[PDB]
Every structure is written in C-alpha cells, then in structure tokens.
Amino acid sequence: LYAAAFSSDAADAELNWTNMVTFGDSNPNSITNLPITVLQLFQSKPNPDTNSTRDSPSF
Amino acid sequence: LYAAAFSSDAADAELNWTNMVTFGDSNPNSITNLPITVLQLFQSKPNPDTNSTRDSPSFKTAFDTGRAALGENNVYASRDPFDRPSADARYIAGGNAPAEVAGGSYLVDDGASGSNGAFYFTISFRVVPALPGTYPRATSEDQGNTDETDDLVVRGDGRYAYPGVYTLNVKFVMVEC
Amino acid sequence: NLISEQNVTVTMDLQPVLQLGMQGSETVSFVFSQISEYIGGLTQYGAVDLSVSSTVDWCLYAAAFSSDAADAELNWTNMVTFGDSNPNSITNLPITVLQLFQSKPNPDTNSTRDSPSFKTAFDTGRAALGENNVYASRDPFDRPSADARYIAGGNAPAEVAGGSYLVDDGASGSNGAFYFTISFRVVPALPGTYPRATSEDQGNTDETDDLVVRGDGRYAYPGVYTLNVKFVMVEC
Amino acid sequence: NLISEQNVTVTMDLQPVLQLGMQGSETVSFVFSQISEYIGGLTQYGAVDLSVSSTVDWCLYAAAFSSDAADAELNWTNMVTFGDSNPNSITNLPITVLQLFQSKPNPDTNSTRDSPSFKTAFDTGRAALGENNVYASRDPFDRPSADARYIAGGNAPAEVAGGSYLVDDGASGSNGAFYFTISFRVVPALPGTYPRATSEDQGNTDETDDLVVRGDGRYAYPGVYTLNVKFVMVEC
C-alpha cells in the first residue's frame, strides 16, 4: 500500500498543484507553480516490513 | 470506449441539465437552462489509438484555468448516445474509424497488466461556474468539441444560472469496432 | 452495435451563497461626556467596512431596529435613566436620530424621495433633514419600498451583478462595487432635542421629528439607550 | 499490477490575509483651550501603534478623508460654530493641516517630490511646509500616485516582504518593519490662520494653503470640526 500525489498538470509531466483562480490584483513576484510535495502525510502505525535507502521509508 | 452526457431533456433534443427545483424568490435574468457541456472530464492515460479532426481527440489535456482552453475537456454532448460518435467527437479509447485497441482483459497480461494496460482508465470530473453566474468553460453544441463559447451570456447577454438543483447523466459506453 | 455501459448521475446543487463580511466592532458606543460632544455631535468614521460576495444580483441596505421597534414603536430601547426627575424629559428617542454616510455612490438606483443613498455630505444645522437618516423600519426582513434608502441597489431590478471583492472583473479589492465603508453620526443639541431627526414615514422625508414635535419643550432624559443597525443583503 | 484505489481531493484555499491592528483610541480629540495651545500647537506622540501582518508584499499609507472630501472638497467637516459672527471667519479648513510623524524610516521607497514618508522632524514655523502633512485625497481606496506619501512601501513594486510582527525573521516585535508608532500634530497660530497647511496638489508640496491663501485676512471660525484618518495596507 502506498500513497501517490497527482494532478492533471502532473499528468502532463509538471508536478504542480492545479490552479483554478487567483485572488488579488497582480504582482510579478507571485508564481502559481507550487510543488506537489508541499503536502505532508503522517501515518499511525510504523511500516510492518520495509527495506529502503533514502531518508525515511514511510510517513 | 467513449463518454456521453445525457438527460431526459437531451432525450427530447434539448441538450440541457434537468432541473428539479429552484432556490430563491425570482429574477427575470435567471434561467434554468444550463449547457450539457458544463461538465469537464479529464482522462488519466493518453488515447492509445486515435485519428480525429477537431480540437483534441481525448480528455487528456490538463484542466486549464479561465476562458483559455474552451474545448480541451468538455464532455461529448449528444441526444442519441447509443450510435457510435462521428469522426470528430471525443473518444476515451479508440475512434470512429477502425482505429481501436485490441481485445483483452485487465486481469491477464499481454505486455503490461493491471492499471498500466490500456484496459483501465481513471476519470476526473470538474465543474467550474463563475461568480457572475455564467459558465465560462461551456462550449457550443456543434459536437461538444469546439472552441466556441456557450455561456449563459450567449443565451441572453446578462443572465446567470438560477440557483437550484440540476441533474445530468454521464454514461461510459463501450462499443464494438 | 453491442455495448456495455455504466451510468453515473451528477447532482449539481447550486446554492444561493450570500456572504456579507464586516471588519468593525460589533458594538459601536457613543459616550457623550463633554459639552462640545453634545453641541457639535459625535461622528465615527469607518466604523463598519462591508465586504460583499454573492451568486445572484443583490441589493444592500441598512435598516435600524430595536425591540421597541419590533413592537411597532420605532424608538431607542432605554436601559436606565441618569438623574432624578423632570416632567419635560421623555425617554422616547426617534430611531432616525442616527445618520449614516456612505463612501461610494450608489452604482444603480432610482427613487422618488430625497436621496436614494447615504452619499450626501454630513450637513450642519437643521438644513438637510433627510439626506443621511437611517431607514427606520419595524420589520426589516422584507425588501424596502421603492422610496427607501438602499446602499447598493434598489427595489426594482436595479441592482449590481453578482461577484466578489476578491477576484477582479474590471476593478478589484476596495475599488469595486463590492466594498463599502460607512460612517456613523449622532448629533444632539444643547437644548436636548435631536434637530436632525426625521419623521417615520419611511425615514427619507424632510419632516422633522424632534422631541419638541412630541411635546414642544421636551429634552432627552439622560441615560443609556440602545439601537440596532443591521446591514441586509437581499437577492434581487 | 491489479490495484484497488481510493482518491481524496485536496483543495487549498490561499486567501489574501491582510491584518492591520492598532493599539490606540479610535477617537483622537484636540481641545484648544489655552492660548499656548493655539500659538505653539497641540502634539500627541504615539497616538496610534500600527502592527502589520500580511501574506503578500504590501504598502502601508495614511490618507485623510471626510464627507466633504468624499464630495471632492478636501475640507474638515464642520459641525457647530462658537461665537456670534464675523465676515472674516471662514469655516473651510484645509485637510492637509494635520501632520503625521513616523517612528521608523521608510524601509523601501522611491518618490519624486519632497519627502517619501513622514520621517522628517516636526519643524517650527513656516519653514518645512510639506515634510509632515497628510496625503489628502478624495478617493483614498485607490493606490496613491508615485509621488504621494507612503508609510511603508511605494507605488512601484518597492515594498516590504510579507510577514508578521509576531514571528522573527531577522528582527521581531516592535523592532521589525511591521510596527509603526505615529504621532499627530495640529498647530494653529494666534492670527487664526494655519501656516503649516499645504496646497492640495498631492498634499506633498512646498506651497502654503493658509486661510490667507483663501482670503488674505480670514481666520478660522471657532467651532467643532472633524476629520478622518485611515491607515490603509494595500497589496503590491
């Protein structure tokens, strides 16, 4: 069992949140390209069986 | 495989959402006539085999923002959805001509299996009105696949959707090639 | 054409979202302690900032109210009286004592009596009598008549298009027709009456309703009075 | 790879939170009772203390206003007149008469005329004429021009980064660029004119707008006048 983040922009190879509207007027230094990995998940139990290499093998 | 939008009003040749009740008191500029193509579908995989003429031959294009796309995700609106769609409609897997995907199952593998095969599709729905009340992303009923607006301002130039309950049917038809 | 279909039902529920936000204190308190406070009156600018969002065409209006007004007596609700006694000192104050001033003009309106909005400048003396007085009503949950005072809209289908103060269609933010700042004024006089009060035909007429109208020599009895002002956004 | 999946849709609503708090009285009262008050003027330090929080880069400015100003006449709103009468006593006082003084310098600004902020010291006499006068406008809800008087920011994308006076990034608390204490001053003169008023080109010019400019021999009519000062934080 795993959890994968996704979006239509991600389906088009751009791992971003899908924008729908922009509150405000404007500013050049305001990009509507947010990373998908902004969200964080926390698990309840530990992983019963895992063998991974990088950082933590579970949430 | 294709997806067709439908309703009883559509069965009576008027491609509209079926109203059930109206919230509020009243207003002359409030119509219970919404385009069927208001809904937008987004496909997961690209179309394995397709050859179309108008706009995009599938729902693979990403969910665009504002009145920019106008046709890349709108549902195929039809009044008689049991006949195979014409050569320029939007299929999910295949096309009007013998441009199709071979027979098989999502259970046994010939190449890839499971959700990686061409026998499994996940579809995302979107409906986006605008606070002016219209639907900027609706397209006209040429075939549901054109870059021509069908907002409520097209009907009256100053009307908004009348608050209430509306109902639409989406049927995913798997026809033989 | 042999097929195998699966049908999903989409049930869209277009609810009538009307959202009026306020960026001021719920309680607006006038404390008349100084002589100048009595003679010149008290004014609080920008006491209420209304931000508007609506799905449908809307009309915004301000209606004054009170429990006494709910019982058909358009008066301030007394709570206590300071002092000992005087025959010519009545605790019956008119609701139209309060005056509101609007920041923007009314985008779309037509009316018959005086000004259809609170845009008029705060006049001095008993010269205006009706260009800023509140819409005093005993039942403010029905839409006001054609000659009342609306803040944004009118009785007829003279309204402003649905939208929000967040996203831009033309102008955005506080420049749009979806943001209004309202100033309050209450001005008594040294004799004790309220020269700027108007009679309660609809609150929008040039007929004075001072305490002398009640008794010809009456002044306000010192004490605590309470009045309600509700800003109603009603669909058109 | 046969699977069975369940999908959740996450909808983050990034709203433009702009939060301006103040730790002073809403009503600031100037009571000129003694001769020295008329001659030297009245000054109140630390009348308001603005604390700022914002999601987006912002510009803070202070704009004077009134109902007369809302009707395109930048004047104090009169309410009552003390005295009997005199031909040379006009109740039309300039809005730019009030003077604001800032505590911190302007963190980032590029302006055209005179000073870009209220940081200059309270000068004595008709010597400064524009280094402290308020930005007087009839429509203060649209962003001021490139040569007006901002408090923290400017018309162009010259601004201060989003943040709060609570959490620290560099400095925190009252030492950051998110906290400003503002002093007020109004100085009349014994002749009755107001020598520190400037003409309303933008409220920021070295051209006097005394009552002698109106009439060359009129002094202020004793009475009660009211003016509004609104501190606006606008997005950049």
XYZ file of C-alpha atoms in Angstrom:
708
model
C 0.000 0.000 0.000
C 1.353 3.414 -0.965
C 0.105 6.979 -1.356
C 0.781 8.915 -4.557
C 0.064 12.576 -5.195
C -1.242 13.544 -8.605
C -2.907 16.236 -10.719
C -3.664 16.963 -14.360
C -0.567 19.161 -14.501
C 1.287 16.178 -13.045
C -0.228 14.008 -15.780
C 1.377 16.476 -18.198
C 4.793 15.945 -16.525
C 4.607 19.108 -14.377
C 4.319 18.008 -10.739
C 2.341 21.047 -9.602
C -0.908 21.910 -7.883
C -3.635 22.705 -10.403
C -4.589 26.375 -10.193
C -8.213 27.414 -10.643
C -8.390 31.146 -9.825
C -6.131 33.906 -8.489
C -7.269 36.114 -5.618
C -5.841 39.625 -5.706
C -4.871 42.051 -8.439
C -1.282 41.209 -9.524
C 2.434 41.082 -8.661
C 5.427 39.961 -10.761
C 6.912 38.014 -7.837
C 3.932 35.680 -7.354
C 4.148 32.346 -9.184
C 1.235 29.921 -9.431
C 3.602 26.926 -9.587
C 3.501 25.167 -6.284
C 5.335 21.911 -5.546
C 3.223 18.800 -5.161
C 5.369 17.704 -2.195
C 4.045 20.683 -0.201
C 1.512 18.348 1.401
C 2.776 16.110 4.200
C 1.244 12.846 5.403
C 1.669 11.240 8.816
C 0.971 7.547 9.408
C -0.385 5.887 12.542
C 1.405 2.634 12.762
C 5.037 2.005 11.588
C 5.731 0.131 8.375
C 5.429 -3.618 9.115
C 8.048 -4.605 6.517
C 10.295 -2.272 4.533
C 13.805 -2.002 3.093
C 14.577 1.398 1.574
C 17.648 3.547 1.033
C 16.798 7.266 1.137
C 15.538 9.258 4.157
C 12.551 7.502 5.810
C 10.776 4.503 4.246
C 7.324 5.575 5.466
C 5.327 8.526 6.833
C -14.674 3.471 -25.275
C -16.311 6.888 -25.056
C -18.233 9.002 -22.554
C -21.580 10.559 -23.470
C -23.548 13.124 -21.495
C -27.303 12.700 -21.450
C -30.573 13.587 -19.718
C -34.308 13.420 -20.336
C -34.177 16.956 -21.727
C -31.403 15.714 -24.010
C -33.648 12.801 -24.991
C -36.115 15.499 -26.060
C -33.410 17.068 -28.294
C -32.684 19.907 -25.832
C -29.150 19.336 -24.525
C -29.647 20.832 -21.065
C -29.305 19.810 -17.443
C -32.580 18.553 -15.993
C -33.879 20.965 -13.366
C -35.607 19.709 -10.231
C -36.223 22.777 -8.028
C -35.344 26.482 -7.882
C -33.870 28.150 -4.804
C -34.690 31.797 -4.170
C -37.644 34.053 -4.864
C -37.331 35.229 -8.513
C -35.423 37.257 -11.131
C -36.046 37.825 -14.861
C -32.343 37.293 -15.624
C -32.126 33.786 -14.139
C -32.631 30.813 -16.464
C -32.790 27.112 -15.644
C -31.153 26.271 -18.992
C -27.601 25.166 -18.472
C -25.366 23.691 -21.183
C -24.740 19.968 -21.017
C -21.055 20.615 -21.801
C -20.679 22.494 -18.493
C -19.074 19.372 -17.035
C -15.456 18.599 -17.919
C -13.756 15.201 -17.846
C -10.023 14.576 -17.555
C -8.550 11.228 -18.587
C -5.573 9.538 -16.948
C -3.829 7.811 -19.856
C -3.489 9.313 -23.325
C -5.590 7.817 -26.090
C -3.763 4.666 -27.285
C -5.053 4.931 -30.868
C -6.945 7.872 -32.351
C -7.230 9.987 -35.503
C -9.640 12.912 -35.215
C -10.188 16.250 -36.923
C -11.393 18.873 -34.428
C -9.554 20.094 -31.303
C -8.408 17.209 -29.040
C -9.424 13.584 -29.680
C -9.495 12.689 -25.973
C -9.769 14.159 -22.461
C -6.007 14.022 -21.850
C -5.371 17.781 -21.809
C -4.828 19.222 -18.343
C -7.501 21.201 -16.507
C -6.952 24.742 -17.755
C -7.811 27.930 -15.864
C -10.088 30.703 -17.087
C -11.546 31.033 -20.564
C -8.374 29.838 -22.273
C -8.960 26.252 -23.385
C -12.663 26.094 -24.362
C -12.835 22.579 -25.731
C -9.957 20.573 -24.286
C -12.055 18.880 -21.584
C -15.775 19.367 -22.291
C -17.969 16.272 -22.400
C -19.336 14.894 -25.665
C -22.940 16.140 -25.636
C -25.413 14.069 -27.648
C -29.152 13.438 -27.761
C -28.906 9.842 -29.064
C -25.793 8.380 -27.429
C -26.236 4.732 -28.488
C -24.999 5.253 -32.054
C -21.250 5.466 -32.454
C -19.946 9.058 -32.344
C -18.772 10.725 -35.532
C -15.141 11.022 -36.606
C -14.544 14.302 -34.731
C -16.112 13.590 -31.327
C -14.067 12.711 -28.219
C -13.412 9.045 -27.510
C -11.654 7.686 -24.442
C -10.048 4.664 -26.129
C -10.400 4.390 -29.904
C -12.086 6.281 -32.700
C -14.872 6.214 -35.256
C -12.747 4.565 -37.954
C -11.079 1.181 -37.340
C -8.600 2.952 -35.062
C -9.112 0.845 -31.963
C -7.443 -1.168 -29.201
C -7.261 -4.947 -29.428
C -9.410 -7.230 -27.318
C -8.205 -8.378 -23.932
C -8.734 -8.114 -20.199
C -7.305 -6.048 -17.367
C -6.758 -9.270 -15.370
C -4.412 -11.323 -17.564
C -1.268 -9.753 -19.009
C -0.171 -9.408 -22.627
C 2.639 -6.921 -22.207
C 1.614 -4.961 -19.112
C -1.104 -5.835 -16.606
C -3.396 -4.153 -14.129
C -3.666 -0.385 -14.278
C -0.739 0.002 -16.694
C -2.636 -1.720 -19.504
C -4.886 0.020 -21.995
C -7.849 -1.617 -20.215
C -8.010 0.686 -17.161
C -8.878 4.394 -17.052
C -9.439 6.790 -14.151
C -11.548 9.851 -14.923
C -11.677 13.141 -13.005
C -14.701 15.452 -13.026
C -14.699 19.241 -12.891
C -17.465 21.843 -12.854
C -16.450 25.497 -12.659
C -19.079 28.257 -12.658
C -18.170 31.924 -12.293
C -19.387 34.286 -9.602
C -21.027 36.432 -12.324
C -23.206 33.304 -12.561
C -22.318 32.136 -16.071
C -20.199 29.147 -17.108
C -17.102 30.456 -18.927
C -15.911 26.958 -19.870
C -19.038 25.761 -21.685
C -18.777 25.154 -25.430
C -21.427 25.283 -28.135
C -23.280 22.187 -29.320
C -21.606 21.663 -32.661
C -20.326 18.362 -31.288
C -19.203 19.411 -27.795
C -15.631 19.622 -29.117
C -15.231 23.158 -30.487
C -13.683 26.451 -29.391
C -16.973 28.380 -29.338
C -18.399 29.678 -26.073
C -21.859 28.626 -24.886
C -22.065 30.698 -21.725
C -25.395 31.973 -20.442
C -24.466 35.351 -21.932
C -24.616 33.557 -25.284
C -28.268 32.836 -24.494
C -29.104 36.312 -23.228
C -26.033 38.514 -22.588
C -26.596 39.270 -18.926
C -28.216 36.172 -17.442
C -26.940 33.972 -14.622
C -27.828 30.451 -13.554
C -30.905 30.309 -11.337
C -29.921 28.662 -8.025
C -31.430 25.228 -7.574
C -30.860 21.525 -8.159
C -29.855 20.258 -11.598
C -29.105 16.705 -12.690
C -27.075 15.220 -15.548
C -26.199 11.688 -16.646
C -22.749 10.558 -17.789
C -22.662 7.138 -19.438
C -19.407 5.435 -20.411
C -20.268 3.370 -23.482
C -18.025 0.568 -24.747
C -18.981 -0.013 -28.370
C -17.544 -2.638 -30.688
C -15.230 -1.786 -33.571
C -23.635 -2.058 -32.025
C -23.357 -4.288 -28.968
C -22.314 -2.248 -25.927
C -21.842 -2.441 -22.170
C -22.433 0.814 -20.317
C -22.060 2.180 -16.803
C -24.034 5.301 -15.894
C -23.100 7.813 -13.193
C -25.517 10.507 -12.022
C -24.169 14.022 -11.468
C -26.213 16.077 -8.992
C -25.156 19.728 -9.044
C -26.578 21.781 -6.169
C -26.367 25.494 -6.987
C -26.942 27.058 -3.587
C -27.561 30.834 -3.200
C -24.411 31.894 -1.358
C -24.705 35.435 0.012
C -21.716 36.473 2.125
C -21.513 39.836 3.895
C -18.338 40.278 5.936
C -17.701 43.124 8.359
C -14.356 44.447 9.588
C -15.533 46.529 12.534
C -16.542 46.116 16.146
C -19.942 44.581 16.825
C -20.642 47.215 19.493
C -20.367 50.875 18.468
C -20.579 53.030 21.591
C -21.297 56.767 21.779
C -20.398 58.297 25.155
C -21.451 61.956 25.406
C -19.412 63.338 28.299
C -18.222 66.774 27.120
C -20.280 69.852 26.307
C -18.723 70.036 22.837
C -19.750 66.402 22.351
C -23.357 67.475 22.934
C -23.342 70.700 20.917
C -21.407 69.503 17.867
C -22.384 65.839 17.931
C -20.288 62.696 17.677
C -19.016 61.137 14.450
C -17.160 57.849 13.997
C -15.612 57.352 10.566
C -15.156 53.922 9.026
C -16.996 52.227 11.878
C -18.110 49.394 9.572
C -16.415 48.071 6.422
C -18.732 45.740 4.498
C -17.253 43.262 2.018
C -19.785 41.658 -0.310
C -19.902 38.367 -2.203
C -22.972 36.983 -3.932
C -24.005 34.412 -6.513
C -27.071 36.387 -7.623
C -27.821 40.048 -8.232
C -28.134 41.671 -4.826
C -29.280 44.827 -3.071
C -27.555 46.020 0.102
C -29.403 48.247 2.553
C -29.062 49.347 6.171
C -32.077 49.029 8.462
C -32.346 50.286 12.023
C -34.173 48.138 14.539
C -34.876 47.527 18.228
C -37.213 45.512 20.422
C -39.413 48.587 20.796
C -39.288 48.880 17.005
C -40.194 45.192 16.763
C -43.276 46.135 18.796
C -44.123 48.865 16.228
C -42.669 51.735 18.303
C -39.666 52.998 16.321
C -37.697 54.176 19.350
C -34.355 53.576 21.004
C -34.571 50.947 23.733
C -33.985 52.608 27.089
C -31.986 50.691 29.680
C -31.516 53.185 32.541
C -32.043 56.891 33.243
C -29.419 59.168 34.779
C -30.759 61.922 37.021
C -33.625 62.377 39.448
C -36.694 63.676 37.544
C -38.237 66.333 35.278
C -41.722 66.424 33.705
C -40.335 67.595 30.352
C -37.778 64.799 29.908
C -39.044 61.872 27.829
C -37.147 58.640 27.212
C -38.691 58.279 23.739
C -35.951 58.915 21.249
C -36.550 58.618 17.497
C -34.750 55.847 15.659
C -33.815 58.197 12.798
C -31.526 60.081 15.213
C -28.565 58.124 13.857
C -27.156 59.133 10.472
C -25.038 57.032 8.118
C -22.621 58.277 5.469
C -21.549 56.100 2.541
C -18.160 56.172 0.839
C -19.032 55.230 -2.747
C -22.060 56.486 -4.668
C -24.876 54.054 -5.342
C -23.960 52.243 -8.594
C -27.558 51.705 -9.757
C -30.700 53.191 -8.222
C -33.854 55.200 -8.840
C -36.212 56.636 -6.229
C -38.725 59.380 -5.525
C -37.970 60.993 -2.152
C -34.804 62.990 -1.350
C -31.603 60.932 -1.854
C -31.695 57.182 -2.576
C -28.403 56.598 -0.741
C -26.258 57.900 2.134
C -23.740 59.586 -0.187
C -24.690 63.150 0.794
C -22.164 65.035 2.910
C -22.758 65.493 6.631
C -24.664 68.773 6.736
C -24.642 71.141 9.714
C -27.747 72.544 11.371
C -31.354 71.664 10.623
C -30.759 72.301 6.926
C -30.590 68.843 5.359
C -33.193 66.814 7.312
C -33.251 63.573 5.386
C -30.074 63.094 3.361
C -28.373 60.837 5.925
C -31.047 59.468 8.281
C -31.315 55.697 8.638
C -34.106 53.618 7.112
C -36.231 53.135 10.240
C -38.431 50.052 9.897
C -40.399 47.848 12.277
C -39.928 44.715 10.119
C -36.664 44.859 8.160
C -36.733 41.328 6.701
C -38.936 42.283 3.753
C -37.397 44.302 0.958
C -37.753 48.074 1.459
C -40.204 50.057 -0.636
C -39.264 51.950 -3.793
C -38.545 55.231 -1.961
C -36.466 53.889 0.940
C -32.665 54.224 1.126
C -30.600 51.439 -0.398
C -26.828 51.225 -0.104
C -26.122 49.203 -3.259
C -29.159 48.551 -5.448
C -32.840 49.380 -5.496
C -36.324 47.987 -5.028
C -36.916 47.329 -8.738
C -34.496 45.136 -10.734
C -31.959 47.956 -10.416
C -29.068 46.017 -8.926
C -25.386 45.133 -9.274
C -24.102 41.955 -10.886
C -23.072 39.032 -8.721
C -19.400 38.769 -7.896
C -16.798 39.063 -5.173
C -14.409 41.638 -3.758
C -11.595 39.068 -4.131
C -11.364 38.367 -7.872
C -11.215 41.204 -10.399
C -13.762 41.951 -13.118
C -12.773 45.466 -14.080
C -11.576 46.755 -10.708
C -10.759 44.665 -7.645
C -10.449 44.984 -3.898
C -11.930 48.038 -2.239
C -12.292 49.926 -5.539
C -15.042 47.574 -6.716
C -18.761 47.899 -6.108
C -18.466 45.112 -3.503
C -16.832 47.102 -0.667
C -18.453 49.902 1.343
C -17.214 51.857 4.362
C -19.904 53.511 6.473
C -19.539 56.388 8.941
C -21.895 56.972 11.875
C -23.052 60.268 13.353
C -25.321 61.136 16.281
C -25.784 64.842 16.955
C -27.906 66.072 19.875
C -28.178 69.754 20.785
C -27.645 71.789 23.938
C -31.437 72.273 24.348
C -31.530 68.460 24.443
C -33.559 67.661 21.326
C -32.323 65.978 18.142
C -32.774 68.554 15.355
C -31.633 66.152 12.615
C -34.287 63.505 13.290
C -36.923 62.997 10.597
C -40.469 61.683 10.838
C -41.002 57.954 10.371
C -42.935 57.882 7.123
C -40.058 55.914 5.625
C -37.090 57.701 7.229
C -36.460 59.535 3.948
C -38.563 62.708 4.170
C -37.994 66.356 5.072
C -40.301 66.376 8.110
C -38.540 66.920 11.423
C -39.159 64.576 14.366
C -37.503 66.445 17.219
C -38.621 65.969 20.809
C -40.422 69.309 20.504
C -42.642 67.535 17.974
C -43.573 65.152 20.793
C -44.048 67.773 23.491
C -42.857 71.259 22.433
C -40.288 71.784 25.153
C -39.020 68.272 25.859
C -35.373 67.254 26.008
C -33.795 63.818 26.133
C -33.667 62.271 29.595
C -30.012 61.437 30.368
C -29.423 57.708 30.437
C -28.422 54.700 28.359
C -30.218 53.953 25.095
C -29.535 51.091 22.702
C -30.300 50.761 18.993
C -29.533 48.108 16.383
C -28.339 48.638 12.809
C -28.379 45.601 10.523
C -26.916 45.645 7.014
C -29.061 43.276 4.956
C -28.020 41.853 1.588
C -31.149 40.689 -0.224
C -31.350 38.865 -3.537
C -32.845 40.733 -6.485
C -0.404 -4.827 -11.322
C -4.013 -5.172 -10.205
C -4.932 -2.440 -7.715
C -7.859 -1.008 -5.779
C -7.556 2.707 -5.108
C -9.390 5.422 -3.195
C -8.858 9.077 -4.102
C -9.140 12.204 -1.954
C -9.216 15.711 -3.422
C -7.279 18.380 -1.518
C -8.428 21.972 -2.092
C -6.085 24.540 -0.543
C -7.683 27.993 -0.299
C -4.851 30.537 -0.214
C -6.699 33.670 0.843
C -5.090 37.159 0.893
C -4.973 37.826 4.630
C -4.094 41.458 5.371
C -4.311 42.271 9.083
C -3.706 45.794 10.395
C -4.104 46.193 14.152
C -3.932 49.381 16.193
C -3.382 49.919 19.912
C -4.769 53.429 20.283
C -8.104 55.110 20.821
C -10.389 55.309 17.801
C -11.269 58.926 18.639
C -8.339 61.347 18.933
C -9.524 64.662 20.366
C -7.770 68.036 20.145
C -9.178 70.565 22.626
C -7.619 74.012 22.159
C -8.460 75.778 25.420
C -5.305 77.709 26.380
C -3.530 80.426 24.418
C -0.290 78.427 24.295
C -2.237 75.602 22.641
C -3.259 77.990 19.857
C 0.195 79.534 19.493
C 2.561 76.571 19.777
C 0.110 73.895 18.656
C -1.049 70.566 20.047
C 1.014 67.392 19.637
C 0.186 63.827 20.679
C 3.023 61.311 20.432
C 2.271 57.631 19.971
C -1.416 58.244 19.315
C -1.645 55.063 17.220
C 0.588 51.975 17.060
C 0.067 50.004 13.846
C 1.002 46.318 13.842
C 1.046 44.689 10.414
C 0.629 41.131 9.148
C 0.259 40.133 5.514
C 0.539 37.164 3.178
C 1.687 39.260 0.205
C 4.125 42.123 -0.230
C 2.331 45.246 0.933
C 2.455 49.028 1.044
C 1.150 50.968 4.048
C -0.039 54.555 3.712
C -2.143 57.073 5.623
C -4.924 59.007 3.897
C -7.070 61.792 5.300
C -10.744 61.869 4.421
C -14.159 63.348 5.220
C -17.652 63.527 3.768
C -16.763 66.903 2.267
C -13.629 65.241 0.893
C -15.802 62.429 -0.466
C -17.649 65.225 -2.280
C -14.391 66.456 -3.908
C -13.839 69.289 -1.393
C -10.822 68.483 0.793
C -12.086 70.233 3.927
C -12.706 69.417 7.567
C -16.348 68.646 8.312
C -17.827 71.459 10.393
C -20.480 70.610 12.972
C -21.048 73.753 15.083
C -19.593 77.266 15.348
C -18.671 79.006 18.591
C -19.158 82.773 18.582
C -21.655 85.234 17.160
C -20.411 86.257 13.669
C -17.685 87.950 11.596
C -17.200 88.468 7.840
C -13.555 87.368 8.105
C -14.217 83.923 9.601
C -14.493 81.079 7.083
C -15.209 77.513 8.194
C -13.297 75.967 5.271
C -10.147 74.497 6.720
C -7.617 72.534 4.651
C -7.440 68.798 5.206
C -3.628 68.841 4.905
C -3.444 70.819 8.175
C -2.902 67.669 10.245
C 0.699 66.483 10.440
C 1.838 62.897 10.962
C 5.258 61.880 12.248
C 6.672 58.383 11.796
C 8.930 56.470 14.167
C 10.930 54.308 11.751
C 12.284 55.457 8.386
C 10.598 54.147 5.266
C 12.201 50.732 4.589
C 11.974 50.978 0.785
C 10.739 53.912 -1.288
C 11.411 55.955 -4.420
C 9.371 59.155 -4.609
C 9.509 62.327 -6.672
C 8.635 65.385 -4.575
C 9.819 66.441 -1.088
C 9.950 63.517 1.394
C 8.715 59.985 0.630
C 7.396 59.498 4.174
C 6.609 61.274 7.461
C 10.057 60.677 8.982
C 11.145 64.333 8.995
C 11.182 66.056 12.377
C 8.435 68.429 13.487
C 9.822 71.722 12.221
C 8.914 75.060 13.801
C 7.497 77.944 11.790
C 6.651 78.116 8.093
C 9.996 76.502 7.312
C 9.177 72.913 6.362
C 5.785 73.153 4.587
C 5.340 69.600 3.387
C 7.582 67.255 5.360
C 4.750 66.139 7.662
C 1.398 66.954 6.014
C -1.101 64.160 5.394
C -1.825 62.694 1.968
C -5.174 64.397 1.317
C -7.298 62.609 -1.276
C -10.962 62.441 -2.241
C -10.727 58.756 -3.270
C -8.284 57.087 -0.866
C -9.184 53.482 -1.756
C -7.110 53.503 -4.949
C -3.366 53.337 -4.516
C -1.639 56.732 -4.219
C 0.393 58.149 -7.080
C 4.149 57.675 -7.408
C 4.922 60.920 -5.532
C 2.473 60.639 -2.622
C 3.366 59.831 0.999
C 3.539 56.154 1.895
C 4.331 54.782 5.337
C 5.989 51.503 4.309
C 6.255 50.950 0.559
C 5.624 52.803 -2.668
C 3.531 52.947 -5.814
C 6.007 50.881 -7.844
C 6.946 47.352 -6.706
C 9.040 48.950 -3.960
C 7.607 47.273 -0.887
C 8.308 45.147 2.192
C 8.164 41.362 2.220
C 5.185 39.524 3.648
C 5.410 38.596 7.300
C 4.139 39.276 10.792
C 5.266 41.258 13.819
C 4.889 38.056 15.887
C 7.386 35.581 14.410
C 11.018 36.566 13.862
C 12.961 36.620 10.601
C 15.899 38.854 11.382
C 14.294 41.117 13.983
C 10.968 40.700 15.769
C 8.441 42.606 17.823
C 8.479 46.379 17.604
C 11.958 46.467 16.027
C 10.767 44.960 12.742
C 9.394 46.706 9.680
C 5.891 45.586 10.729
C 5.308 48.033 13.615
C 4.963 51.818 13.365
C 4.048 54.329 16.071
C 2.588 57.542 14.674
C 2.449 60.988 16.286
C -0.138 63.652 15.440
C 0.257 67.424 15.412
C -2.047 70.352 14.662
C -0.582 73.833 15.058
C -2.751 76.926 14.522
C -1.464 80.468 15.021
C -2.589 83.445 17.081
C -3.680 85.317 13.902
C -6.014 82.344 13.401
C -4.615 81.030 10.126
C -2.852 77.668 9.872
C 0.648 78.334 8.493
C 1.555 74.644 8.133
C -1.128 73.799 5.564
C -0.014 72.965 2.025
C -1.920 73.218 -1.242
C -3.599 70.017 -2.396
C -1.591 69.193 -5.493
C -0.931 65.923 -3.682
C -0.614 67.133 -0.084
C 3.167 66.957 -0.539
C 4.213 70.330 -1.979
C 6.001 73.404 -0.638
C 3.127 75.786 -1.420
C 1.235 77.193 1.545
C -2.535 76.780 1.917
C -3.207 79.090 4.841
C -6.546 80.822 5.256
C -4.856 83.938 3.871
C -4.403 81.929 0.667
C -8.186 81.663 0.561
C -8.905 85.262 1.501
C -5.851 87.190 2.763
C -7.322 88.198 6.083
C -9.631 85.405 7.224
C -9.014 83.455 10.423
C -10.589 80.189 11.494
C -14.106 80.458 12.898
C -14.162 78.902 16.395
C -16.172 75.707 16.385
C -16.047 71.925 16.159
C -14.507 70.299 13.092
C -13.925 66.611 12.420
C -11.560 64.826 10.044
C -10.920 61.148 9.351
C -7.521 59.476 9.011
C -7.486 55.951 7.593
C -4.339 53.821 7.526
C -4.598 51.529 4.503
C -2.445 48.464 3.893
C -2.684 47.645 0.193
C -1.232 44.709 -1.697
C 1.688 45.295 -4.046
